């Protein structure tokens, strides 16, 4: 930050200057920030310019001023170079150009002879000029301007005049006027008159002939306006149309005018265009292609860098543009080639084994036939003396007797500080114990009591030397003298795992437990394992509450403030298997239903048997049902359930059992209904009597849903007179039916009757009831 | 470049022999500092006034006393080093005086003993410091009594033991006490005690141990330990030692009535047993030895610089026996739990630091055998924002329709407020452009209208800074054709296709990776080839397929700024 190279702020810009302008001087700017302040030099035409006092060119704070300019000694390209002790940089190339407009030739123009009824071409022949001009035509005398109608075409490219069909009105003298529009005023140049002579008039129409043909290839940059001209001769005047061969034209550009204008060409407009001139006599066609190119841009540049001497570096620079650009490298204002270590490859720079002479300003230059761009950076190499303030050696290095120690010495130095280890005043060297790796790490094995003391690391390099000290003392290692034993239990009266340790008599010793690398909690949330506390050298832990979910890889660890030791053990908890799943009802019959289920978790003990329970929705309790086979084995997954009463809904569940006990019941099965069946219970509550004269009423108790056993439930009542041998059967549909009335005028009052009843459904017939004696009205 | 005082020379304990006629005592103290530090001295708790004049002087930190006396100068001294940053405390140094008094002038009573028994002759040494060495003289100098099995001398009380007196022991006895100081070897006589005896009967008795070593003998590590087992008996009893709970280490086992250990280690703890045995019988005595040590360090704090608004944890651990206690000092004054500082048995916790928590801190570990110190310096820092280390990207590229991240994290303490601005319009969180409260900016579904300049402003109560980047949009590479899976045998040829589209400006590079491993097409005799090589065609062909050529083939189509991939599978039997 104290010193930095020249960084540009303002760079020179191109200037267009009128040759006969009233201005007296031209200013080109160049400014750079530097510390110390930079010095500026200027290059013209690739060579250095003699900045002499008084002689035209003057230097004002970096800027270059040229007074009373002329095209013979000033027009050209200039560069500004900024320099200081760190390095030099070069600004972008700046063009200064002059504009002018000459006068028309004094030689008389020959008269043009043509046939009446034929298109005629009249040249203009503009003089030397820059930039482009605007062209007009006049007839006979100024200011009579020929209108730009459908019969006369005036070209803005060549300035010529085209007449589609000549008649007697076109005879006269023509003149071409140039009105080059300067940015401040307009200068006009008037051409010598040319006489147009016309021969005898013919009488014939003709097909169009296109004369002003736009070039096949037109190159344009992104953001320019592109004009295409298409003029043709023809009687009558042909119509002009523009088409895109490889696409669709914009509606705003689809015009019948003989000129096609694109205000801002983008990457889309690239392709082939076709102009067609059509009349009743025929058509003529022109084809030409428009391409689009751009100017280089940046994608990845370089930045300031500080590197340590003896390292390697890689720099990159990426530019994008159409056509693809080329990238070259400059240092301090001169091109870079493959030197001893510098490797330049078409865009990337490789440094190997940096030195103190490879510092300065580096520039990356991208170039193509439409422009150039520059990018700057600064490389600074550094060399330092060894400093231990960042990684000092351990000031205290406690070590356990019988183990090993490793002490690394790594200072901050360049190129690389070499180190040597010593113990007190005795220099340590390779032996069958002490080891010194090339990195400087000191490794001591088989550590004993006589190795305590003060060790020193000495580092040095061709800058200077540094030095540091540590002290080593020897303790006794913490050891385990008893390890816990693996075990297994179901729900017993709890188990005490043991862990005994011996430590140095000077430092505190703490025991800690863990389960499968998850932290343990010997406190008391609900069921809890607990920990005793009598003396330091004991760590027994008792697993209480006689419950589940307390198995894994138990680990006891005895640790001090310095080192630690550990041992491992395993416990298992056995028990009844888990509940089954996947209860599926199949083969739904009147009394038999097949049940299928998936095997549940065995809990590390094979399942011995199964038990099936059933219930009636919605408030029926779970009841064990008769199963085929009577004893279901653990490996079986299907069974039969018997004893079911037909045509009610049922739900089922499964329980598993092993030699260790009985597991949990499974979830309820899906609601299913058994098939229909014939009735099995005869109706009861037979009674009756009274009614209208000649009528007999028989009443019975309505039957519930448990014994209907199917749909279409109803009753059949067989009744007869006392002493008669013929039974009359009546059908009463409906389960809730409870009475029947039989009407007959021949029935005497208080006539005894013998009756019986039976129940039926859609499946079959059930048993009949006992015969009862009733009386009529 | 400033720091707090760091001690190089600390005061040391001094014992002054009275005999030597020196006129000045020096207690050293030196503390490196920048700027140089001043010194104060504390004498037995209270501060010391070092006014020029009397015998208390100052020689540049070092304290000098002219002509010290026991009545005005014995005691404890501490050195306090102070500079603008903070002050530090030096380890205590004890100044003590050594002297010896003479024996009392009163005559000693004669000792009457009956021949055939052993007799005890007292010495009664006067006041003394340090310990002495004792001898006995018979009648007249230099008749030194030889150290045989019958004439017995104790090195801790000076008493004289006679196992069995006879007629040859009649006479006068005196006790001579000698001191071995650093510069003097003064020795003192005594009076003459007359020993008169009685009749004789030569009977035999069982040994009786009289001089008993104490039941518990506390001994630090590194202190020579002597055990005395003195006995009576007729004839002379024999002395044998044994360890109750192990071996006696017979490298130095002896039959003398004294047992010596030059340097006590932790393995010598336990109970010893002495036995005096003769043909008549035996006597047995027991006693235990316990070892102890001084505090030592295991983890020590180090000087630290912390940024305002942070938190700090500091630890300090000591090892000794009995277990040491740890306390904390700041600027030479005790530090209790208050405000943002928490102290817990050697754990120091700073929460949300400020500019007033900069200074010298110290950790003290002590027990009934010693005290040790450790020091460190804490410096708090506050900084202005700077973007030199982490400037915003300067040439940010963007792919069309993508999402762009722009982080902005300067180097400041405390954290600085961050604002964003495109051109001269300050952005707000919305559905397309959003800022997050760590400073990062997010933009979604980028378009050509977003090209331009972006700027990040950072500011805190010490200053402000800004950094600008340039955002431009391009055309993203998109895959139009993908390869397909196939199966072949060994030696078969297969062809897979891949097509992409990109911006007309940059270059496409097409590659193929077999199971994420790039395929080398330039290998001599290689089995892979590029076919239908065009700008947007990256078809590859495998010739003479092998078993290793079966796997997943991934087509990579990449430019300098973006890439796009497709996948297919090939099996070789
Ligand atoms: C003290 O003994 C140790 C052990 O033999 C020495 O360390 C050994 O150092 C050599 C190099 O002197 C290492 O061999 C070479 O290492 C380079 C590292 O890039 C490697 O490229 C070579 O292929 C070769 O392996 C060797 O690995 C290393 N071994 C160990 C165990 O450290 C040490 O150098 C000796 N002390 C001195 C002062 O030489
Ligand atoms: C260990 O490192 C020091 C630090 O460079 C070496 O230099 C001494 O530094 C102290 C501290 O300022 C000075 O008081 C001494 O005068 C320095 N010595 C010399 C010779 O300049 C020191 O020499 C190193 N130790 C050894 C044994 O070389
Ligand atoms: C508007 O700005 C606010 C803060 O400047 C953003 O709020 C953050 O939202 C995220 C996600 O909900 C939280 O994790 C942060 O804690 C919020 N910051 C604060 C300071 O509250 C918010 O995301 C922005 N709006 C949108 C649409 O993103
Ligand atoms: C963004 O930061 C720059 C500095 O990095 C500011 O530029 C400074 O502007 C002030 C006055 O506007 C000048 O006095 C300083 O000399 C400028 N510094 C440099 C290094 O040139 C800039 O003003 C900041 N932007 C805003 C909006 O404040
Ligand atoms: C530099 O070159 C241009 C074009 O080649 C030329 O017009 C100009 O005269 C040259 N410069 C000088 C000083 O002649
Ligand atoms: C080195 O280790 C071996 C076995 O571990 C041991 O016998 C030997 O005594 C050790 N060396 C020293 C110096 O203690
Ligand atoms: C403490 O120092 C004072 C200063 O002379 C002295 O008088 C006093 O005896 C000392 N106390 C102890 C216990 O040493």
Curated annotation (Swiss-Prot), chain A:
Task: Show where the record puts the motif Cell attachment site.
Answer: 763-765
Give the originating organism. Answer: Homo sapiens (Human)
Q: List the disulfide bonds.
A: 30-80, 124-176, 230-275, 317-364
Summary of the function given for this chain in its UniProt record: In conjunction with another transmembrane protein, CNTNAP2, contributes to the organization of axonal domains at nodes of Ranvier by maintaining voltage-gated potassium channels at the juxtaparanodal region. May be involved in cell adhesion.
What family does this belong to? Belongs to the immunoglobulin superfamily. Contactin family.
Please report the stretch or stretches of sequence annotated as the Ig-like C2-type domain: 12-97, 102-191, 208-291, 296-380, 386-473, 478-572
State the name under which the record lists this protein: Contactin-2
Q: What disease is associated with this protein?
A: Epilepsy, early-onset, 5, with or without developmental delay: An autosomal recessive neurologic disorder characterized by a combination of various seizure types with onset in the first decade of life or during adolescence. Most patients have developmental delay, impaired intellectual development, and behavioral abnormalities.
- Tell me which residues are glycosylated: 45, 167, 173, 430, 446, 467, 494
Return the annotated region ranges for Disordered.
663-689
Record GO cellular component, one term: axon initial segment
Q: What is the phylogenetic placement of the source species in the record?
A: Eukaryota, Metazoa, Chordata, Craniata, Vertebrata
């Amino acid at each position: 930050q104290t010193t930095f190279g020249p960084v540009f702020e303002d760079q020179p810009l191109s200037v267009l200057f009128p040759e006969e302008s009233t201005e007296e001087q031209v200013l080109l700017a160049c400014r750079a920030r530097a510390s110390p302040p930079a010095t500026y030099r200027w290059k013209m035409n690739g060579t250095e310019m003699k900045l002499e006092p008084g002689s035209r060119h003057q230097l004002v704070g970096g800027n270059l001023v040229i007074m009373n300019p002329t095209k013979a000694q000033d027009a050209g390209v200039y560069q500004c170079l900024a320099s200081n002790p760190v390095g030099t940089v070069v600004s972008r190339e700046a063009i200064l150009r002059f504009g002018f407009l000459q006068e028309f030739s004094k030689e008389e123009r020959d008269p043009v002879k043509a046939h009446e009824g034929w298109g005629v071409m009249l040249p203009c022949n503009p003089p030397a000029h820059y930039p482009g001009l605007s062209y007009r035509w006049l007839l006979n005398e100024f200011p009579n301007f020929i209108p730009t109608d459908g019969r006369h075409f005036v070209s803005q490219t060549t300035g010529n005049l085209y007449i589609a069909r000549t008649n007697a009105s076109d005879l006269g003298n023509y003149s071409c006027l140039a009105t080059s529009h300067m940015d401040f005023s307009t200068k006009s140049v008037f051409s010598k008159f040319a006489q147009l002579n016309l021969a005898a008039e013919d009488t014939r129409l003709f097909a169009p002939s296109i004369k002003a043909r736009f070039p096949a290839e037109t190159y344009a940059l992104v953001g320019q306006q592109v004009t295409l001209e298409c003029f043709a001769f023809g009687n009558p005047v042909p119509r002009i149309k523009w088409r895109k061969v490889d696409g669709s034209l914009s509606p705003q550009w689809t015009t019948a005018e003989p000129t096609l204008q694109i205000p801002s060409v983008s990457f889309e407009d690239e392709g082939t265009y076709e102009c067609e001139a059509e009349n009743s006599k025929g058509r003529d066609t022109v084809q030409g292609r428009i391409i689009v190119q751009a100017q280089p841009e940046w994608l990845k540049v370089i930045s300031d860098t500080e590197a340590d001497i003896g390292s390697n570096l890689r720099w990159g620079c990426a530019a994008a543009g159409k056509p693809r650009p080329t990238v070259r490298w400059l240092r301090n204002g001169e091109p870079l080639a493959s030197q001893n270590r510098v490797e330049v490859l078409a865009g990337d720079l490789r440094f190997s084994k940096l030195s103190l002479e490879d510092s300065g300003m580096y520039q990356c230059v991208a170039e193509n036939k439409h422009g150039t761009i520059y990018a700057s950076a600064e490389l600074a190499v550094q060399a330092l003396a060894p400093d231990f303030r960042l990684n000092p050696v351990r000031r205290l290095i406690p070590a356990a007797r019988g183990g090993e120690i490793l002490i690394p010495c790594q200072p901050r130095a360049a190129p690389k500080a070499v180190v040597l280890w010593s113990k007190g005043t005795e220099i340590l060297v390779n032996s069958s114990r002490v080891t010194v790796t090339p990195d400087g790490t000191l490794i001591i094995r088989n550590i004993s009591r006589s190795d305590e003391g003060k060790y020193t690391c000495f580092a040095e390099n061709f800058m200077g030397k540094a030095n540091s000290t540590g002290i080593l003392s020897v303790r006794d290692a913490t050891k385990i003298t008893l390890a816990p034993s693996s075990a297994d239990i179901n729900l017993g009266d709890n188990l005490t795992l043991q862990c005994h340790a011996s430590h140095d008599p000077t430092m505190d010793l703490t025991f800690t437990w863990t389960l499968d690398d998850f932290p343990i909690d010997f406190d008391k949330p609900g069921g809890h394992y607990r920990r005793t506390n009598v003396k330091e050298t004991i760590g027994d832990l008792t697993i209480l509450n006689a419950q589940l979910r307390h198995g894994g890889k138990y680990t006891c660890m005895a640790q001090t403030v310095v080192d630690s030791a550990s041992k491992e053990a395993t416990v298992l908890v056995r028990g009844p298997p888990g509940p089954p799943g996947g209860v599926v009802v199949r083969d739904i019959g009147d009394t038999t239903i097949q049940l299928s289920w998936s095997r549940g978790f065995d809990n590390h003990s094979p399942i011995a048997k199964y038990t099936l329970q059933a219930r009636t929705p919605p408030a029926g309790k779970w009841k064990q049902v008769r199963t085929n086979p009577a004893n279901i084995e653990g490996n079986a997954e299907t069974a039969q359930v018997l004893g079911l009463t037909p045509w009610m809904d049922y739900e089922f569940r499964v329980i598993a059992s092993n030699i260790l006990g009985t597991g949990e019941p499974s979830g309820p099965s899906s609601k299913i209904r058994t098939r229909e069946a014939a009735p099995s219970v005869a109706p009861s509550g037979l009674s009756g009597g009274g009614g209208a004269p000649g009528e007999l009423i028989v009443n019975w108790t309505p039957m519930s849903r448990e014994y209907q056993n199917g749909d279409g439930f109803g009753y059949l009542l067989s009744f007869r007179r006392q002493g008669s041998t013929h039974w009359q059967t009546a059908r009463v549909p409906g389960a809730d039916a409870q009475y029947f009335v039989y009407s007959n005028e021949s029935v005497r009052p208080y006539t005894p009757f013998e009756v019986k009843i039976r129940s039926y459904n859609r499946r079959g017939d059930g048993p009949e009831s006992l015969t009862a004696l009733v009386y009529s009205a």
